[PDB]
Each structure stands twice: as C-alpha cells, then as structure tokens.
C-alpha cells in the first residue's frame, strides 16, 4: 500500500511547479494535485498518537485507491481519526485479519480486500 503512495507523492512533488497556475491544469493534473494534497494532509499526524501497523495499512489503502477524493482537504485528519475509531469499535476482527495477514506475499487478498472495502463503505455511509 506504500509503493503507490510513494509514486503519487512523487508526482505531486513533480507537479508542485504547476500548482501556481489556476485553470491551466487539465483534469489529470488537477486530480493528481488534489490526490497529493490529500495524501500530504493524511501524513500530518498529532504528537503522542502512534498508529499500529494494521491501522496504517488500512488508512493508506483507503487514501490511495480512490476512496478519499470526495473528502475535502481541511477535514482529512478528522476523517482519519474517525475512520480509525470506527475500525477499533465497529470491526476489530478486520484489524486482526489485517494484522495476522500482513506478512503474506500478496496482501490484498480477496477476503481482506472485500472486508476492508465493506468497512470503508459502511463508514462513508454513516458519515
């Protein structure tokens, strides 16, 4: 879940030069800039708030696979905190499945994929 995050942040840094222009950016460039800003806001983390690895991979999966574009930039930190609270309360078994299934060579297996996606959909609906 982090290789593609690194790629997207790289394109954001590459396109940071064009960000000054207004309306001169095509749909692809504007979408890439929005994704980059969203990822950057996601990385912003308060002090004394560690995230277990399962929460990290779940959050990055949510952020990178187009489940976060609708969320506006100023509220992404609260979105992440709310989503982590929802996971810790709603579906702890999802986090356990992530934790015991993180070592596997191909992490996005069908069961973990569908469970995590269902959790994200339920959270977004409840929002």
């Amino acid at each position: 879940v982090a290789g593609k995050l690194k790629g997207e942040l790289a394109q954001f840094r590459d396109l940071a030069a064009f960000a000054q222009f207004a309306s001169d950016l095509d749909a692809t460039t504007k979408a890439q800039i929005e994704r980059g800003q969203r990822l950057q806001e996601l990385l912003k983390q308060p002090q004394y708030q560690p995230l277990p690895v399962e929460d990290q991979v779940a959050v990055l999966y949510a952020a990178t696979n187009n489940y976060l574009d609708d969320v506006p930039v100023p509220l992404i930190t609260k979105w992440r905190d709310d989503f982590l609270a929802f996971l810790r309360t709603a579906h702890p078994e999802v986090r356990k499945l992530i934790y015991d299934n993180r070592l596997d060579r191909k992490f996005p297996t069908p069961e973990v994929k569908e469970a995590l996606e269902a959790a994200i959909k339920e959270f977004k609906a409840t929002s």
């Binding site: 929802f86 810790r88 309360t89 709603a90 702890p92 339920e122 609906a125 409840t126």
Partner: protein, 55 residues
C-alpha cells in the same frame, strides 16, 4: 403522457427512495447499537488493563 408518467414515476421513485432511506435508518440504528456495545467492551477492556497494571 409526459405529465402522467412524470407524476407516477415521481411517486414510485419517492417510494423506492423511502425504502432506501428506511434501510439507511435501520443501518444507523444498528450501527449506533453496535458502536455503543463496542465502546462498552473497549472501556471494559481498558478498565481491566488498568486494574492489571495496578495489581
């Protein structure tokens, strides 16, 4: 025909959206109950951890 069909489909889609909103309301109530239960369970686990730490 346009007027009649528009009104009829308006009512029918209103009923369909009412069913969807009923599902949404049921989901909201069930999620509130499940979240209350999960908060209670997590608080109990935290209190047990605090008591074990105290011991």
């Amino acid at each position: 025909e346009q007027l009649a069909n528009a009104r009829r489909d308006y009512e029918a889609e209103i009923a369909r959206a009412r069913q969807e909103a009923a599902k949404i309301v049921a989901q909201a109530q069930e999620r509130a109950k499940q979240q209350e239960a999960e908060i209670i369970a997590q608080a109990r686990r935290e209190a047990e951890r605090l008591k074990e730490e105290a011991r």
